[PDB]
Structures are given as C-alpha cells and as structure tokens.
C-alpha cells in the first residue's frame, strides 16, 4: 500500500509538471469523433432529474 | 450471464458467412487484449467535455 | 478546512481573482487542484468564484 501510494503521488506530480499527455490536436480528434457518432445516433441528451419525477 | 455470452460468441462465429472455408486461402484471426492502463490514464479535463456531450 | 491558522481568511486581491478565474477556465470543476495553487481553501475559492 505504501509503495503504491508513493509511486501514485509521483505520477500525479509528474502529470501536473509535465502537463497533459494527450497533447491537443489528438484531444480535438477524440471530441470531434464522439460528436459525429452521437450525431448519427440521434442520441438526445440526458436532462437533469426534475423535482417531480414519478420514478 | 457471462457464460451465455461465451455461447453467443461461439455460435456467433459459426454463423458467419463462409467462415471456415480455406479454399481460396482465407485467413481468420482471433485477437484478445486489454487496454492496459485505461482508468488511470483518463484525463479529467477531457472527461468533462466528453460528459457535456451526454448529460 | 477552516480552523487551521495557515488558512487565509480575508478579501481576495486583484491578482488572486485573475489567477483564480484563469485557472478555473484552465481546469474546469477541479477545486482541489486549484486551491493549493492560489493558496486558499477549496470551499473558499468556490464560494468566491460563484
């Protein structure tokens, strides 16, 4: 447990120092692709649960 | 249940079109793998924009 | 969270507001990451952001 949490704290600190590894253009590619998928799938967003909800 | 999934998977293979025919030199490939670190590499900032597309 | 004397209880200067807004636009919704960077409590900088 102690070792694992150490290397953990290491990886967090290295993720803050070294910045996001996903770069940028890649991330845009992901977001865009997902957008196209949900588009062709007619998926309507899930709204917030209303105060009156019978279920 | 998972084992029933195994059954759907086998008969799913066996029901494919001309699946076992090696006459012309056809070649089948089964591939099993893991995403290795997946949970650990999810980026929160990205995950937020990804969820904004859903809910 | 609160009683610790090292915690800073006072108004936010202009620099702290610039820094808080910029960072909050940088890493949305992450308060426990931002709070140490500006030197304030997460709940406090939340309240100040809203």
């Amino acid at each position: 447990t102690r070792l694992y949490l150490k290397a953990e704290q290491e990886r967090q600190h290295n993720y803050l120092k070294d910045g996001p590894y996903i770069t940028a253009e890649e991330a845009v590619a992901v977001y865009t692709t997902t957008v196209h998928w949900l588009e062709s799938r007619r998926f309507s967003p899930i709204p917030f649960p209303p105060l009156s909800y019978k279920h | 249940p998972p084992p029933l999934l195994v059954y759907k998977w086998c008969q799913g293979i066996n029901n494919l079109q001309d699946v076992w025919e090696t006459s012309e030199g056809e070649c089948n490939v089964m591939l099993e793998s893991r995403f290795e670190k997946m949970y650990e590499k999810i980026d929160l900032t990205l995950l937020n924009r990804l969820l904004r597309l859903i809910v | 969270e609160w009683l610790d004397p090292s915690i800073k209880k006072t108004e936010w200067s202009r620099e702290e507001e610039e820094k808080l807004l910029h960072l909050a636009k940088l890493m949305p919704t992450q308060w426990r990451t931002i709070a140490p960077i500006i030197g304030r409590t997460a709940a406090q900088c939340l309240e100040h952001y809203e």
């Binding site: 070294d18 910045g19 996001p20 996903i22 770069t23 | 900032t45 | 890493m27």
Partner: peptide, 27 residues
C-alpha cells in the same frame, strides 16, 4: 555555533505547466 543541532522535536513521537492552458482553450 555551526554544530548547533536543531532539536529533532518529533511530529510523530507546487507548480503547474502552461500546456494545460493550450489544451483547455483548444477544447
């Protein structure tokens, strides 16, 4: 004076990269 030793009174007994900006503004 140099070899004054701080008493070891016992308690038992951060920076950020700017790439986050480029990413976030990109998204």
């Amino acid at each position: 004076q140099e070899w004054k030793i701080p008493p070891c009174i016992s308690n038992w007994k951060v920076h950020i990269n700017e790439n986050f900006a480029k990413l976030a503004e990109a998204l």
